[PDB]
Every structure is written in C-alpha cells, then in structure tokens.
Design brief:
This protein has 207 residues and is an alpha+beta fold. Helix content is 29%, strand content 31%. The radius of gyration is 17 Å and the shape is globular. The protein binds chloride ion. Chloride ion binds next to α1. The PDB classes it as hydrolase.
Length: 207
C-alpha cells in the first residue's frame, strides 16, 4: 500500500494573519464598490455590494497553494512531493508578501510576491497556463478572498496571471492604502503603498 499525497501543499496563514488579510480584502471590496470609477463602469462587470457578489469565501484559514496534488492524481504531484526542499520545509513558518489586491467578474484575491527561497517550493510543471506566457516563475501565486457562485477558486490565479500580462504590456483613484487601477473588462487592482506581510506555515492539506 502506497501513501496518499495531500489534496494540496501550500502556505497556510496563521489565524491572526488570515483574519487580518480577510479584513483587508473586505475593506477593499467595500471601498471599490463605493468608488465613482467602479460605479460608472458597472456595465462591464442602486449599487452592487461586492462582499455579496463574491458569495463563496474560502473556509477556515486563508492559504496560498504551491502544488495541487489531488492525493496523487494531479500531474507532477509525486514529482513535487518527493523534493528535498518540500520535505525540509514541511511544517515550517514563512512570511508572505502581498503587493496588490484585485477583483474581476469571477474572483477577488491577493497577489503574492514570493521570495526566491519561497520560489524553491513553487512547482515546475509541464502544463502551464497560456496566460502565464513571459511572466516570472511564481507569478500565479495568490490568496483567494472570494469568488462568484459559479466559479472555482483556482480561477483566482488565472485571473491574476491575466492581470499581470496586462500590466506587463503597459489610475482612477487614490485609496488610503494604495492606488486604484481600472484594467478593463471588469478588472480592478489596488496597488499597495506598503506590501502586506502575513505569517504562514508551509504544509499539506488532506481534508
Ligand atoms: Cl480567517
């Protein structure tokens, strides 16, 4: 009998960090929903409460996934899990840097900017999203804050990749914690003046 892998590996925020980032996310959603520029462009996306719009919020603690394994059914799962760095890092505490919050018609999330140490724990898979073309490794790294009723949480990273592609290719408001950008097609990013730092434990989730 072989051993099951986790459902996924990743960085699981401490309860305090999780609560801090959730609160920040919610404040962002309330501020964006109330912003003139958002309300004006509501056609591409009475007023909309975005906390309600993103009705599926993650359970438990917030987390940033490295490798989704599906207990070993996902491509590259065993290959990822067998790495020394993964084993050595299992249970270890990290600090994650969050540089921006974003919204799309599908998801709400936080952009994680990995250290190169943390990048050692990022997977190197054969199948990459076409939206990840020409972006630095680990660009997909995110914390999902919410999504629409008919959307899967994994969409949040795809949405992030798409936003970063737009930013790579080359400002409608000033919020207290950063500058607000309208990227078109219902996409919005808050670029934080100060990166947000959260504490997290790298480990595996089985459910
Ligand atoms: Cl929480």
């Amino acid at each position: 009998e072989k051993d099951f892998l986790p459902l996924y590996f990743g960085w699981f925020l401490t309860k305090k960090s999780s609560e801090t980032l959730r609160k920040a996310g919610q404040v962002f959603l309330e501020e964006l929903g109330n912003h003139k520029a958002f309300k004006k462009e509501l056609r591409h996306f009475e007023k909309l409460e975005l906390v309600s719009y993103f009705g599926k919020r993650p359970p438990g603690v917030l987390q940033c996934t490295t490798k989704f394994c599906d207990y070993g059914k996902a491509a590259g799962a065993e290959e990822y899990a067998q790495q020394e760095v993964v084993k050595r890092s299992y249970g270890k505490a990290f600090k994650l840097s969050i540089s921006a919050l974003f919204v799309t018609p599908k998801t709400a999330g936080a952009q994680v900017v990995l250290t190169d140490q943390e990048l050692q724990l990022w997977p190197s898979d054969l199948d990459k999203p076409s939206a990840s073309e020409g972006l630095p490794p680990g660009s997909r790294a995110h914390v999902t804050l919410g999504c629409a009723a008919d959307v899967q949480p994994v969409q949040t990273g795809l949405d992030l990749l798409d936003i970063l592609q737009q930013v790579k290719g080359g400002a409608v408001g000033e919020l207290p914690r950063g500058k607000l950008y309208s990227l078109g097609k219902g996409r919005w990013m808050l670029s934080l003046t100060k990166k947000m730092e959260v504490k997290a434990i790298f480990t595996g989730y089985y459910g």
